[PDB]
RNA sequence: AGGAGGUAAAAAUGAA
RNA sequence: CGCUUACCACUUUGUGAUUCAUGACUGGGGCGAAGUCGUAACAAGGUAACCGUAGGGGAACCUGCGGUUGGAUCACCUCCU
RNA sequence: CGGCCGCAAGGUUAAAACUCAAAUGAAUUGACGGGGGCCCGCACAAGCGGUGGAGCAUGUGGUUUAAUUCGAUGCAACGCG
RNA sequence: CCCGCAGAAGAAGCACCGGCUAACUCCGUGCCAGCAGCCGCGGUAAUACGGAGGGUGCAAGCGUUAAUCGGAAUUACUGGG
RNA sequence: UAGCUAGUAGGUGGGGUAACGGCUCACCUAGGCGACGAUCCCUAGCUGGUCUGAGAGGAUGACCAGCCACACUGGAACUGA
């Protein structure tokens, strides 16, 4: 399989495509809904990043080496280093706003509101 | 007390430190503003109110709190810059001043429009 | 009334 | 008139002094929410707390030494002139 | 940070940026304490009989459906209305 | 400067109204949008948020921001610990 | 910011200018300044006054007036009262 951190790719959901400019010319794609969690499709599928193709098949081209083995890895490099580019999105965003938290705060407000009753005629 | 210490080191003086360090004196000032973004107040209140970062002439790169329902900024915008905290968000010290040159005034407001520089409507 | 020894056991949190 | 001498601005060089900006990375601090673990302090806070100092540890903190009170606690039971 | 001293750990003199609208002292009424004193109570002790182990009735939570109506839901709701 | 012609004809806005601080009701949105010099306001009866009407103040100016002194006996010589 | 200066402290003589003087040379003397702050670094035109303030003070020195300094940067001289 394809080694990513937490989704971890199952490899079958990789079209790598051998071509001449050689059979070191790889067009790789990726799928962008390939049994990623929930959301992991959600940021795969939409992206304001570069190499991002609008059908999610992504388009990365290995050229630049003559070697085979380098072009299958420098491609994969520039996967999970690109899966991070989109799991990014403003580096910490959900963003996750508690419910439970915010009864406690509300008491705290009727708490000062108990004790703005002070002085006057 | 002393005196004959006082003659020897006078009494001395406070420092005169202002709560607006956006330039001496300058009761407003240019900026080119990036990064309009939205925050939570503290504790005590909570609203997702709207802010902007912001980039003077003479350097500094302090943030400014765009008040008003609804505002007309985008990513560059130039912007004009007044005194004044709003207590509510920790780490501000400036208010936009609604109205001036790329800051339209509110939509719709009759009661207080002079703050929000909108035009009166003569129709 | 002065004065001498002496008798006591593990156990968090409620969210800044 | 021309020639020659000393003083000199500027320039170049070497050479340090001082300060203003800038710097991959890194340190500690403030603020914000309170999600993770823990529960140190306030009652004797469940081992009294704190100060100085050294060591140790994921964290509050723990331990040793000396000091201070900004510490609590003298309740009952067998006994004698 | 710098100066000075120190073998070293550091010591001494001594800022600002930033951030809050509070921090703090004594004392007062209560509250609470794995503080003390006096006193009470099927609180426990000394004894009797039950639940939870079985079947069934009833109530609630949950679940399925077109409905399985509403409220109550630590003690002080659950054969309650 | 003075006189005459002449239709009231050509000429009023701005902040604020919970308290500090003179001055109130209603509607809409419901810790959302937003308000704010200080304390704070808002979870479907908000005098504080937006609108409407009325009202308080000043007035061809009215408010925000910036700066100075005073209030500040919060550098106290006058006048502190 | 703790020591600072070596025509630098002074004398004699020459020279020099409208005029006194290390203003400038030769020789000799070894002093001068400094904690009531010398030197160093930073900031700044000064005053009459302006504004505030009960006063003492504090901020400030744009406009009107007086003084000083500069004329693109720096150096020198001439002409001329």
Redesign the interface.
């Known amino acids: 399989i394809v080694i990513s951190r937490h989704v971890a790719i199952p490899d079958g959901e990789l079209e790598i495509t051998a071509i001449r400019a050689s059979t070191a010319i790889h067009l790789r794609f990726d799928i962008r809904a390939s049994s990623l969690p929930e959301y992991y499709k959600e940021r795969l599928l939409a992206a304001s990043h570069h190499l991002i193709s609008s059908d999610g098949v992504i388009v990365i081209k290995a050229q630049e080496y003559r070697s085979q083995e380098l072009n299958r890895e420098a491609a994969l490099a520039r996967l999970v280093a690109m899966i991070k580019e989109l799991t990014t999105e403003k580096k910490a965003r959900r963003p996750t706003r508690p419910t439970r938290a915010?009864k406690e705060?509300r008491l705290?407000?009727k708490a000062?509101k108990s004790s703005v009753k002070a002085m006057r005629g | 007390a002393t005196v004959n210490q006082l003659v020897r080191k006078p009494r001395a003086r406070k420092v005169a430190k202002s709560n607006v360090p956006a330039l001496e004196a300058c009761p407003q000032k240019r900026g080119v503003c990036t990064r309009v973004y939205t925050t939570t107040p503290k504790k005590p209140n909570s609203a997702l109110r709207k802010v902007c970062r912001v980039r003077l002439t003479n350097g500094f790169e302090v943030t400014s709190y765009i008040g008003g329902e609804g505002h007309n900024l985008q990513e560059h915008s130039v912007i004009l810059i007044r005194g004044g905290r709003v207590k509510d968000l920790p780490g501000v010290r400036y208010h936009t001043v609604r109205g001036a040159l790329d800051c339209s005034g509110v939509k719709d407001r009759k009661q207080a429009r002079s703050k929000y520089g909108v035009k009166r409507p003569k129709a």
């Open positions: 915010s705060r705290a407000s000062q």
